[PDB]
Ligand binder design. Structure first.
Ligand SMILES: O=C(O)[C@H]1O[C@@H](Oc2cc(O)c3c(=O)c(-c4ccc(O)cc4)coc3c2)[C@H](O)[C@@H](O)[C@@H]1O
Ligand SMILES: O=C(O)[C@H]1O[C@@H](Oc2cc(O)c3c(=O)c(-c4ccc(O)cc4)coc3c2)[C@H](O)[C@@H](O)[C@@H]1O
Lengths: 115, 116, 116, 115
């Protein structure tokens, strides 16, 4: 699994479950092409997005549909979505974990890049 | 000043100075139209991006050019930029502060929204 | 103003108003001696805690009473308080801003340290 | 495992390995009594701190020795340590994960409380 997404809810102190996540790759003409998507599990994780073969060097965008998540909880949030944009680079370690911590008017994201 | 951006550096414990910021607005055709840009000051603040008149209802994207910041400091960071996308002024005019706290492999952004 | 505290609320997108803050200094006997206290303003800021003369070198603990804040708002949060423990002024006087961003089950704190 | 600690490094984008963690319980006389301790693993996690039998309701303090961590990397940090103080409560879910994200002048902590 070269790319994993983990989402946490800072209001409830829980995984953020059933959050839609869309991954895009930047194409030559500077547009964003769909690449992978899924919904977080009961543990707030989304595995199996891509394969080592498919996940080549490039710029990627991970879009997390935070607005739907909060609205389903009856909370009006600030952001349309959370967006994580990064270059995948073969130099560094093999596995990318993109973590996000959600509040209604804030989010934090960190990358854990390991072998 | 209805839109302000403040950026801190979690490695140095300082304002993040000279951080480029580009703001876009979603147009009728659903493309991102350039709206305003600037750079943070010595206090890590960026004022004067827009006016109450021009900051109409819409979906805005605040791009904070974190890679250019870390690279200008000779550090290789993870993200290309921090993106903050939100609907503004859809219940009337508000004042928005977008705050961001930067590390090379992490950032945190929050909004402070007040009613004038 | 050598020690200031600023607190934001990540649920409301607002300053965190009326947050109690207690500051302690580690004494010669290694106990925490009360040093200064106050409450954040309508801007989420707390000024006037101490003076340059009284803010000598030492290990300080800034306790931000987050539970009392969330409970005063009728919310049941996770933490008792946010604690920020640091050595101050050991290379000469500095100005410290302790910022904190609060959610019911999470907080983030950063320091901005400047040289007057 | 009713109490797990996970520590991440926001400068390197990695688990924070070999970080000392001390857990204390608040005793009747308002002092902090040692309760459990350990060092984070290669995955930045510290398991096996306590047992369900031992982890009763009460106020606990998790002290993470961030200062030593940064100094071992040649970085001068701000905090003496990171401190997480909370009440354990039998009402809510069973398992506490205390997560911390470390930078030299900042840290963030969130609780993930699950069944
Ligand atoms: O000029 C003003 O009137 C006020 O501006 C504030 O600037 C900031 C600036 C900030 O930049 C932050 C932050 O950045 C965060 C923060 C902390 C952790 C995170 O994970 C995310 C955000 C909290 O409070 C803040 C305050 C000053 O602290 C305050 O003294 C001053 O009077
Ligand atoms: O089971 C899995 O497959 C994987 O679950 C993930 O667990 C977590 C769990 C977490 O709990 C966090 C966090 O909580 C923080 C965090 C803290 C404060 C912030 O402001 C932002 C992020 C970031 O990464 C994380 C990762 C890990 O990637 C991995 O150890 C585990 O095998």
């Amino acid at each position: 699994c070269p790319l994993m997404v983990k989402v946490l809810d800072a209001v409830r102190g829980s995984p953020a479950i059933n959050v839609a996540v869309h991954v895009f790759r930047k194409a030559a003409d500077d547009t964003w092409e769909p690449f992978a998507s899924g919904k977080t599990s009961e543990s707030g994780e989304l595995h199996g997005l891509t394969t080592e073969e498919e996940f080549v060097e490039g710029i990627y965008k991970v879009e997390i549909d935070t607005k739907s998540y909060w609205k389903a909880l009856g909370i009006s949030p600030f952001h349309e979505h959370a967006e994580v944009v990064f270059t995948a680079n073969d130099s560094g370690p093999r596995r990318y974990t993109i973590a996000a911590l959600l509040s209604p008017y804030s989010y934090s994201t960190t990358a854990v890049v390991t072998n």
